[PDB]
Amino acid sequence: SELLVNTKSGKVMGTRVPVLSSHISAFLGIPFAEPPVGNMRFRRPEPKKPWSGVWNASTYPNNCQQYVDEQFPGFSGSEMWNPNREMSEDCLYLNIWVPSPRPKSTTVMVWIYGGGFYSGSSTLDVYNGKYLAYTEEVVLVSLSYRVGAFGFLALHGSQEAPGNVGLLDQRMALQWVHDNIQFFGGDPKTVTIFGESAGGASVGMHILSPGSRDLFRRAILQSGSPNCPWASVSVAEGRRRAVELGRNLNCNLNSDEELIHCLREKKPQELIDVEWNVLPFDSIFRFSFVPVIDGEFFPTSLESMLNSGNFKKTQILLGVNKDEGSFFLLYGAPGFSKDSESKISREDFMSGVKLSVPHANDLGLDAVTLQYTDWMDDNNGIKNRDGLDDIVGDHNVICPLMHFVNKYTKFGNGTYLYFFNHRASNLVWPEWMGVIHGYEIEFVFGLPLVKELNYTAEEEALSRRIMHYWATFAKTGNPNEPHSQESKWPLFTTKEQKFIDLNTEPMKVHQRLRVQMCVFWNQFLPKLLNAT
């Protein structure tokens, strides 16, 4: 039977699931590690001990213990991102959708979810791999990993809480795919890791980390890259936040051993309730427990690794959405609301600017203001709103990614860059937020192919295109079909820097994605701050 599979750790029994008037096989909730519970909290993951009998892999597993967004209770725009299963520290599981009948050896894609390293779930409806596996004849894995303090509490020099264990979670899932995916009809030689935002930064991190490079063939990054300002902290800052967590929880702070014993003594929700309190003064665009530049997982600084070519050299496919700052402003910047147009005074604009670069001196603040003000009229509320939105997205997502794209292309074996600027017709978030970060994912997983979802027919075509770009890139390292007849997505080169738009209109090619702004953030503003 095609729903039974022997793996190096035991038999698993999957379930037959329907998809677009057909059916495929799904293996939900396969364990890939020992449950990181008890005195294993904070520790590096251990592999799942082998089990006798058959593992019931017919239903989704628990989500990891995380913060849950309650800003807009009952609102679908926010709750579609929350855990839809019971939360638990026993959460290290993966899911697999296998085409029917079981292929002999086909391309594998491993999804890494985002959520700022403080949240995320492999079981969300937008991450349901059955449409992609079915439409494109791939094996679709989605892994899970510890978020929050549970996965990124960094007390460097200790071995009970070294940091980065959530990335080690992802690595173990990749090791598991390498060792077992053959039995599910997946080709372990042709594994593409892809992920969005925090998962995009994660993919990039795996490309950099020597201990991860041999576990996958190529990589896709969506709206995230490892050098993003929110995606890592220094060893000193991670230790400061870990101590600050213990102070919030009446923990003996004398030794790492005693700090950690107290943190292990706590219930999961106690850690979560206080985790935003360890942030520095400027915290509106930051997350508490993120990967740490530890000299182990990352041998040196990310920038020196990028400069010296110290990273896996393969093909990469990556891009951004038009409006990457909108959620940051809505959730954290005073003056933005879900239900207003969020027009911004000249006064409110200056504050946003200050918030955006809180360590800039007066000269740096003036530089950002000069760069993003419409001087033909200062007090246009919509212009001020759009300008602040551009600041936040450029500085936290787009220009980090562009920096990563440029450094990587000097050494890699093929870069493909995209700019996704189509707002879904059925988007429930307000109009001012635009082409929102995260709202290309539904196209990548083929949600528009489902009629009930209320997408337009041109949105079904786009999704079909994007799924085919993605899966063709995964199979061959080029998103374009061999000598087909549609518009070709050109290689991103150092001298020409071409990229494409992804939207419902016919594809056109452009060059130099937001280069003026990225030159400001990546080259100019650093030099100005290092000189005052």
Ligand X SMILES: *[C@@H]1O[C@H](CO)[C@@H](O)[C@H](O)[C@H]1NC(C)=O
Residues 437 and 197 sit within 8 Å (Cβ to Cβ): yes
Under the binding rule (CB under 6 A), the answer on residue 413 touching ligand X is: yes
CB nearer to its own copies: give 321 or 522. 522
Q: How far is the CB of 228 from ligand X (least distance, A)?
A: 25
Joined tokens for residue 329: 């402003």
Q: How far is the CB of 19 from Cl ion (least distance, A)?
A: 5
Binding flags for its own copies, 343-382, as an x/- string (CB under 8 A) = -------------------xx--xx--x----xxx-----
Under the binding rule (CB under 5 A), the answer on residue 403 touching Cl ion is: yes
Among 6, 56, 269, 456, binds ligand X (CB under 6 A): 56
Q: How far is the CB of 439 from ligand X (least distance, A)?
A: 14
SS3 7: strand
Q: Rounded CA gap, 470 and 84, in Å? A: 27
Q: How far is the CB of 304 from its own copies (least distance, A)?
A: 23
The interface region with ligand X, picked from 52-60, 123-131, 369-377, 458-466 by CB under 6 A, is 52-60
Q: Rounded CA gap, 109 and 289, in Å? A: 27
CA distances from 312 to 143, 273, 309, 315, 392 (A): 21, 38, 8, 9, 30
| Residue 332: contacted member of ligand DQ5, its own copies, Cl ion, none (CB under 5 to 8 Å, by partner type) | ligand DQ5
Residue type, position 166, single letter: G
Among 253, 453, 515, 528, binds ligand X (CB under 6 A): 453
Strand locations in 434-502 (E): 498-502
Q: Pick from 405, 353, 383: which is nearest to 514 by CA?
A: 405
| Residue 284: contacted member of ligand DQ5, its own copies, Cl ion, none (CB under 5 to 8 Å, by partner type) | ligand DQ5
Under the binding rule (CB under 6 A), the answer on residue 494 touching ligand X is: no
Cis before 101? omega within 30: yes
Joined tokens for residue 113: 């979810």
| Residue 515: contacted member of Cl ion, ligand DQ5, its own copies, none (CB under 5 to 8 Å, by partner type) | its own copies
Active-site positions? 197, 324, 437
Under the binding rule (CB under 5 A), the answer on residue 357 touching Cl ion is: yes
Under the binding rule (CB under 6 A), the answer on residue 59 touching ligand X is: yes
Q: How far is the CB of 414 from ligand X (least distance, A)?
A: 4
Binding flags for Cl ion, 3-42, as an x/- string (CB under 5 A) = ---x------------x-----------------------
- Which of positions 502-531 make contact with its own copies (CB under 8 A)? 511-512, 515-516, 519-520, 523-524, 527-528, 531
CB nearer to ligand DQ5: give 287 or 443. 287
Q: Which backbone phi and psi does 149 adopt, to 5 degrees?
A: -60, -35
Q: How far is the CB of 524 from its own copies (least distance, A)?
A: 5
Q: How far is the CB of 386 from its own copies (least distance, A)?
A: 17
| Sheet with 10-13, side-by-side order of all strands | 4-7, 10-13, 54-56
Q: How many residues bind ligand X (CB under 6 A)?
A: 9
Among 3, 20, 34, 58, binds ligand X (CB under 6 A): 58
Strand locations in 4-115 (E): 4-7, 10-13, 15-18, 23-31, 54-56, 63-64, 87-88, 93-98, 106-112
SS3 262: helix
| Residue 279: contacted member of ligand DQ5, ligand X, Cl ion, none (CB under 5 to 8 Å, by partner type) | ligand DQ5
- Which of positions 485-524 make contact with Cl ion (CB under 5 A)? 522
CB nearer to Cl ion: give 209 or 522. 522
Binding flags for ligand X, 123-142, as an x/- string (CB under 6 A) = --------------------
DSSP state of 479: S
CB nearer to ligand X: give 339 or 452. 452
SS3 97: strand
Among 252, 304, 454, 511, binds ligand X (CB under 6 A): 454
Residues 408 and 308 sit within 8 Å (Cβ to Cβ): no
Residues 373 and 353 sit within 8 Å (Cβ to Cβ): no
Residues 83 and 121 sit within 8 Å (Cβ to Cβ): yes
CB nearer to ligand X: give 358 or 414. 414
Among 299, 364, 414, 490, binds ligand X (CB under 6 A): 414
- b/e burial code for range 501-518 (CB count within 10 A of at least 16 → b): bbbeeeeeeeeebbeebb
Q: Rounded CA gap, 192 and 110, in Å? A: 6
Under the binding rule (CB under 8 A), the answer on residue 1 touching its own copies is: no
Closest residue to ligand DQ5 in the complex (CB): 332
- Burial class, 235, CB count within 10 angstroms (exposed 0-12 / middle 13-18 / buried 19+): middle
Q: Pick from 518, 485, 513, 483: which is nearest to 501 by CA?
A: 513
Distance of alpha carbon 306 from the chain centroid: 20
Residues 188 and 162 sit within 8 Å (Cβ to Cβ): no
- Burial class, 468, CB count within 10 angstroms (exposed 0-12 / middle 13-18 / buried 19+): middle
Binding site for Cl ion (CB under 5 A): 6, 19, 357-359, 403, 406, 522
Binding site for its own copies (CB under 8 A): 362-363, 366-367, 370, 375-377, 511-512, 515-516, 519-520, 523-524, 527-528, 531-532
